[PDB]
Amino acid sequence: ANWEHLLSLKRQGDTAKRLRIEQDDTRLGFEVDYDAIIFSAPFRSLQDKTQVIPLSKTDFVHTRLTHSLEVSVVGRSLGRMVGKKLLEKYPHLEQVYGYKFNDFGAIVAAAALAHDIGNPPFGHSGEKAIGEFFKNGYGKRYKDSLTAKEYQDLIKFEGNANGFKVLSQSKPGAQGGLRLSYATLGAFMKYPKESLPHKPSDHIADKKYGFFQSERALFEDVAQELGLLKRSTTDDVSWSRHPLAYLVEAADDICYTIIDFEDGINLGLIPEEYALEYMVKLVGQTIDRNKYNALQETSDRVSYLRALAIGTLINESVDTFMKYEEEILAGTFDQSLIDKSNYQAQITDIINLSIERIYNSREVIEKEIAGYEILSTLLEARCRALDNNDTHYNQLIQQLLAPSLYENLIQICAEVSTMTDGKALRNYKKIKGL
């Protein structure tokens, strides 16, 4: 595998190569990617989407937008530091080809900013509501008119794969979606495989899949340009992760681990009495305890803890990446960067506490139950309208929600998934009379 190819500036449709040495550094393709996401309608919709806790007006809770912002800031810092060490290890990359360390921060920052852009509302219940609808619900009907992989895309519908669709969807007047650089699309793709075969190993890259059948041709072009290593020689295609995808994943791991905990303390789902017990190993050498004791607000004490722990995990993740860089470059690294952490046990303890106190709180459970009905209802109305587009009621459903059979079902799923929490509830409420 070669870093020169992995850092591709190609955009979908390019008829001629884009050499890094010929880029205007004030218009660097990788940094244009970041700005294109900031201004995109899919990214704006993250402002009104729950990350974990249902939104309120009585308290601040992280939305998908604020979470994605934080992951891109952590990812930019990981890419910057890993970039400098990579340029020191492969100095031809800078001296010949012209890559700079901020290039790597820009790729990770942009892929991180977009990493959750395709996720359905109401969390992973959203994903399973969609999947079960086609497994056993009304969607079962279509099984026999679909290939095994087309159907697998639906019964195991994945927000990561919908994110890739969102980023590249071609519509009239706008071919290629956001047209992000192939390097950013590679750093985005943490599961570079189709929906089948299902979990062919215990590798984290095989836990899910990363693109739908409708996007397969695009990711084939991406993987070829990047020179990603094959992980399958059958007609079920699969590739080793772009190395920078490991940094997007780590930024994400770091943020939801530490920041879910922070939110849980500020919302009162986790007793503040637990904050230091769970963070002491992550912060013990850098914490200024006198400063911590002088802070008079809970939210200030816990944000100080969060900033210390995130700093700790960033430095360690940079070191883990470089110690396993050749294994990662050869596609033989079998785990995540955080799985190798010396704080693995503490991370696991924090995550389990959050699962117990936040994910299993009444409000999060209530939301996931409500989500299952809201999304199943919307999917039933979309699909009935698709099957009999002639009735008056179905023409209304089309006007309200959406003004090849697989291409239609995958598009219905993508459109339901990119609904904000509010719009989905309002449409649900009107379909049901309220």
Under the rule (CB under 5 A), what is the footprint of Mn ion?
Answer: 116, 252
Using rule CB under 8 A, residue 26 touches a copy of itself: yes
134 versus 256: smaller Cβ distance to a copy of itself: 256
Query: Can you tell me the distance from the alpha carbon of 313 to that of 302, in angstroms, rounded to the nearest whole number?
Result: 16
Site for a copy of itself contains 73 (CB under 8 A): yes
By a kind-dependent CB cut-off of 5 to 8 A, residue 280 interacts, out of a copy of itself, Mn ion, none, with none
Report DSSP letters for 384-414, one per residue: HHHH-TTSHHHHHHHHHH---HHHHHHHHHH
Rg of the chain (C-alpha set) = 22
Q: Which does 252 bind (CB under 5 to 8 A by kind): Mn ion, a copy of itself, none?
A: Mn ion
Which distant-in-sequence residues (6+ apart) come within 8 Å of 397 by Cβ?
381, 382, 384, 385, 431
Minimum CB distance to a copy of itself, residue 296 (Å)? 6
Is 158 near a copy of itself (CB under 8 A)?
Answer: no
Exposure string over 101-110, b if 16+ CB within 10 A, otherwise e: bbbbbbbbbb
* Least distance (Å) between residue 174 CB and Mn ion: 26
Query: Which are the contacts of 407, defined by CB distance < 8 A and separation ≥ 6?
Result: 214
Between 194 and 421, CB nearer to a copy of itself:
421
8-state DSSP, 119: P
Residue 434 found at the interface with a copy of itself (CB under 8 A) = no
Minimum separation from the CB atom of position 49 to a copy of itself (A): 11
Contact pick of 4, 48, 221, 334 for a copy of itself (by CB under 8 A): 48
Q: Which is nearer to a copy of itself, 220 or 300 (CB)?
A: 300
Q: Which two tokens stand for residue 397?
A: 């459903």
Specify the residue, 123 or 139, whose C-beta has the smaller distance to Mn ion.
123
38 makes contact with a copy of itself (CB under 8 A): yes
Contact 99, 117 (CB under 8 A): no
279 belongs to the binding site for a copy of itself (CB under 8 A): no
SS3 127: helix
Toward a copy of itself, which CB reaches closer, 230 or 430? 430
Closer of 33 and 116 to Mn ion (Cβ)? 116
**Cis ω on the peptide bond leading into residue 197 (within 30° of 0)?**
yes
- Taking a C-beta distance cutoff of 8 angstroms, is the pair 266, 298 a contact? yes
Using rule CB under 8 A, residue 335 touches a copy of itself: no
Site for a copy of itself, residues 287 to 326, rule: CB under 8 A: 291-296, 299-300, 303, 306-307
Which of Mn ion, a copy of itself, none sits in contact with 80, Cβ below 5 to 8 A by type?
A: a copy of itself
**In 3D, which of 240, 259, 251, 6 has the Cα closest to residue 112?**
251
Judged by CB under 8 A, the residue of 21, 39, 362, 404 near a copy of itself is: 39
Torsion sign (Cα): 66, 71, 72, 76: positive
- Helix, strand, or coil here: 139? helix
Q: Contact with a copy of itself (CB under 8 A): which of 173, 202, 235, 390? A: 173
Helices and strands per DSSP (H, E), number in the chain: 21, 0
- Binding residues vs a copy of itself (CB under 8 A): 25-26, 34-35, 38-39, 41, 44-45, 47-48, 56-58, 60, 63, 65-66, 69-70, 73, 77, 80-81, 84, 101-102, 171-174, 291-296, 299-300, 303, 306-307, 420, 422-423, 425-426
